[PDB]
Design a protein around this ligand. Sequence first.
Ligand SMILES: Nc1ncnc2c1ncn2[C@@H]1O[C@H](COP(=O)(O)OP(=O)(O)OP(O)(O)=S)[C@@H](O)[C@H]1O
Ligand SMILES: Nc1ncnc2c1ncn2[C@@H]1O[C@H](COP(=O)(O)OP(=O)(O)OP(O)(O)=S)[C@@H](O)[C@H]1O
Ligand SMILES: Nc1ncnc2c1ncn2[C@@H]1O[C@H](COP(=O)(O)OP(=O)(O)OP(O)(O)=S)[C@@H](O)[C@H]1O
Ligand SMILES: [Zn+2]
Ligand SMILES: [Zn+2]
Ligand SMILES: [Zn+2]
Lengths: 385, 385, 385
Amino acid sequence: SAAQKFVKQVIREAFLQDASDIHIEPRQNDVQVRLRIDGALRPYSTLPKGALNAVISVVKIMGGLNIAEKRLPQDGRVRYREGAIDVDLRLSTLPTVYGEKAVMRLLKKASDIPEIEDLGFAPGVFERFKEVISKPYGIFLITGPTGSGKSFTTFSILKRIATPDKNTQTIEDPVEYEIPGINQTQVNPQAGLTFARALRAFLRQDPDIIMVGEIRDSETAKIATEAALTGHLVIATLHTNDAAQAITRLDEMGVEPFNISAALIGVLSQRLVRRVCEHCKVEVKPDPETLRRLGLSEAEIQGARLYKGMGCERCGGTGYKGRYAIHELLVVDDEIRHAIVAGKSATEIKEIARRKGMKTLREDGLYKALQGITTLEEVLARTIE
Amino acid sequence: SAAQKFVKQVIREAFLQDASDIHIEPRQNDVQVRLRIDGALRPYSTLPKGALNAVISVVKIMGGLNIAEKRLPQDGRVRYREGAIDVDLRLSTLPTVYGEKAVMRLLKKASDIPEIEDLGFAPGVFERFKEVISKPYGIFLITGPTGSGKSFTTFSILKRIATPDKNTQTIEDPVEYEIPGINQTQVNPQAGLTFARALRAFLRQDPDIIMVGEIRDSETAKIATEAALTGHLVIATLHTNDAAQAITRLDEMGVEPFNISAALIGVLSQRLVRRVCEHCKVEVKPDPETLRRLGLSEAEIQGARLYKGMGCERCGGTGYKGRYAIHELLVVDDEIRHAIVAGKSATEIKEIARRKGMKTLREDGLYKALQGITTLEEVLARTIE
Amino acid sequence: SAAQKFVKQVIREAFLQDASDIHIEPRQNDVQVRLRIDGALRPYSTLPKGALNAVISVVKIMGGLNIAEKRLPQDGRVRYREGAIDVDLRLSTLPTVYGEKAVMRLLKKASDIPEIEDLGFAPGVFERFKEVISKPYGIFLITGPTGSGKSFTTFSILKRIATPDKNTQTIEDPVEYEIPGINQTQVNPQAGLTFARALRAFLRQDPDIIMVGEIRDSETAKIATEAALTGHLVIATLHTNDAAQAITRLDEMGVEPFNISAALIGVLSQRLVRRVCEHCKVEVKPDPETLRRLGLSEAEIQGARLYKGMGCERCGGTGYKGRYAIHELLVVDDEIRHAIVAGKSATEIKEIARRKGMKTLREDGLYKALQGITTLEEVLARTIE
Ligand SMILES: Nc1ncnc2c1ncn2[C@@H]1O[C@H](COP(=O)(O)OP(=O)(O)OP(O)(O)=S)[C@@H](O)[C@H]1O
Ligand SMILES: Nc1ncnc2c1ncn2[C@@H]1O[C@H](COP(=O)(O)OP(=O)(O)OP(O)(O)=S)[C@@H](O)[C@H]1O
Ligand SMILES: Nc1ncnc2c1ncn2[C@@H]1O[C@H](COP(=O)(O)OP(=O)(O)OP(O)(O)=S)[C@@H](O)[C@H]1O
Ligand SMILES: [Zn+2]
Ligand SMILES: [Zn+2]
Ligand SMILES: [Zn+2]
């Protein structure tokens, strides 16, 4: 067909450019198609309004979606294959004013998961991070907004840690990609298999490592914490702007600070900044007023260099190509446990940690921005500085 | 054709007078016709009682309603075109003791939606408003009664922030304006497309900005907060007499307070006041004693220029033409976060917010009455403070 | 049948090596079986993928699990006896991506039933325990999670109170031990001999002490309570984490509040906590804030020491050797009854009880931990939320 011919090419072009998502959107007069690359959407094509139905058909067919239904959202999955390329897609259709909208999400593979040496950790923090994950039990929290690289990190860790002498059990919503040598369980709300329900079962499963996909309940916060106290390694995900507030979040979710204190081994706060395109990279001579505001001594200010991409055909005008990770790693020690009990605020916990040598998201992004890995713009945007 | 001539004229006059609604009311010995202008009903004309059924007939033909049925309400939509007039009309017929009443609403378009610079924000509030909508994720609430300008503000915001690198998704009941650049979806009961069912689907649609037209049920209030939590920007409308009560209401609706404190960027409480007609505008010497019980200081009573419109042909005698918005903008910071958890009252929150810089509705009203934008009574009639 | 033979061989080999746990894990092309020996998982054997369901059915029948239910976790206990192979198995089935995973833990072979003086009650709590179980009649509830030591405690009580001048009748699912001096009846669902059917018969068997293995009906709860009212002593097992919630549990099962208030002598809640290896004990300097937060008085904090096992040859790798029980004893008085009728919450009731001097599991666990019986972390794990 011609609609079949379009879906093949847009998926192929997405796989070739490492696009995260494909948006097929009807509008007043046309159909716009967009690709998400490096977290940001780009224009790809524009179709005649009549093209919409046939295209939606091709997509819905791939995922076993009902062509008859156009009044309700639908959800499908397809293992898509075209000679060279092989990728799973999650298809989503949504009724819109101008007709159904389709979104195709290209899922990653276990192949794609990095080793912990290739995460982007600075030299000093890397050795601390290597240490905290090597502990035999406790709970290690990874926090940040969606698209922060949190899953990539958690599985990077599990890739180094889940050896055959251990049981590695995972609760996930959904399971994105299957990992060899660990046990994975998928949340099933229709059946009633919730995060809290599966976690309770894990305790009956002789676990060694438990991966909690996401902590939203009080209930899962307690069980995840109880697994930790029981003597297991717990890797879980929380949604917090900061490392320290993960401590306060657990308190508000109802974990008493003495439980938190006896189980929390460390918190990692992750954000994902965009990487300056190499072809169109250009030095910008910077601004002493910022750098001043992130109290970089005025000895490290005129030594400092900053960079931006200019936009070229090789980055679609973006000035960016690929992404990089920035890290705020809070390691729990004997001065911090005491501050968790006694009830210090997140701000107070953080000043202690920083005074021990914790680098913040800002301070990390900046160190990477002074290498031209990313722009100062991107750093202040994803964090708050 | 005489009834056709009347309907033709009254829509023409409503159009030119910026009239929300036309009211055609059967009364004991006549028919009364009123225009709502600036939110206030206004006498337009009187018809002789035996002319009712001809006029209702014209109105029904326009919206394709049944003439035979006079015992049950009816509803229609017409795209009205006469001369240079192009308006969408919503038609309502309803049996009353003296016959059927008719209401025709004149609908606005996307072109009527202002730029955020033209929303009427005081300069100190406007800079904070801007910093609130420019955040990457979180939930921002716009509260107040119907006809307060909630939608105008919402889309004004989306005009500035729904840039083409982002997915901007809408759920609405109904979709009012057709907006370029964004994706809109309408609630559909008959198909089972709830607010909550739509919103659940949005989370598999790779969204950046989410707009929830109205939060009515407890489930929708939870999913929108969740979506904010995970890393999405959410703009939603709520009904509260006060900015602080939007916090409390989410609580009452079932949202975990730790989730509220975590996701909430801010609240905007809004009303509409009437502008002083400036063909009537006559300066009025303020009464200091009355301006003192109203919490204004001695400095503010100086530099106070009050006005009242002495009715004219252009303002229909009311002394007012046009409307203006008054604002109460709660910006969430850490102290408001700690008070949201720990279950402080709305009154407690409010006093925190003010101490931190928030102007109440009354205060923003008074401030603009001293600029002669509006009059004192309008401020007092639109604010219980 | 080939499946049945495999399961018998694995349990045989686990038994003989003294393996802790047996793991049957589906994989992508493979069903992998692992044994945990001396703390580590070792590879036992590999089964083809198409053998998975056959094996899972075998182990489900052994633990009385549902074969049909494949998308929820299940749990059962089994006593495996084939020849010299005699071992209590805890069975756990977990839904995973490649199918159901089954885990079987080999339980430490049950020790002989002790005197109530060796159950490990605190000195003060013990005097109350002794006083509750001396009562001539009424119902005494023993409650807690699976493997709490419930059955072990009830038979220890029966060891003391079941005297030859009394008839002591027992309804069990199933019968575990072989105690002299008493009469024991096992539930036969096949024959129609239910918990409730037996309990009505017991009232025609002239009893003195009745023991119900489990209350999981309304009718059983109602008959057991009725038996307590007429003037029989009833020891019964519930599965509630909190002692005070066990009262609410009976109300949910339909027992009239006034029959609960008149019959309930008290409720025992217990946990099993791992014990520190004596040959390996070290002193830990505890944190005053933590102790304070756990309700310890300033006098007690003064010379408080805590203990940990470092890992010793005697205790394998872990610093723990054997178990000990912690207790929470709710003794019903006149005030409690008044709360039950016109029912206050389990929270209020627990408050009242604590005000009358009732020790909590954590408080009980703490003091035992303060003596070196166990670690705080073991105590915190079994008392969380
Ligand atoms: N360290 C990294 N360096 C560069 N790119 C990365 C890195 N980690 C992740 N990415 C990319 O960014 C995307 C974000 O993926 P994720 O790791 O899932 O982030 P996440 O949203 O925090 O994970 P979730 O939502 O908890 S399942 C990945 O698909 C990769 O394309
Ligand atoms: N800032 C403003 N200044 C002056 N007039 C305004 C302003 N905002 C809105 N209006 C007028 O007031 C009318 C009602 O505003 P809306 O925003 O549509 O009402 P709303 O009830 O607050 O929100 P809804 O219920 O979702 S339409 C608009 O149609 C305009 O005519
Ligand atoms: N106070 C105790 N100290 C040491 N070990 C105990 C104690 N109580 C029980 N145990 C042992 O731990 C196991 C406890 O099992 P039970 O006493 O049967 O518990 P239970 O509460 O009946 O569990 P369920 O739900 O009936 S399977 C038994 O093997 C006991 O031998
Ligand atoms: Zn470039
Ligand atoms: Zn005028
Ligand atoms: Zn030891």
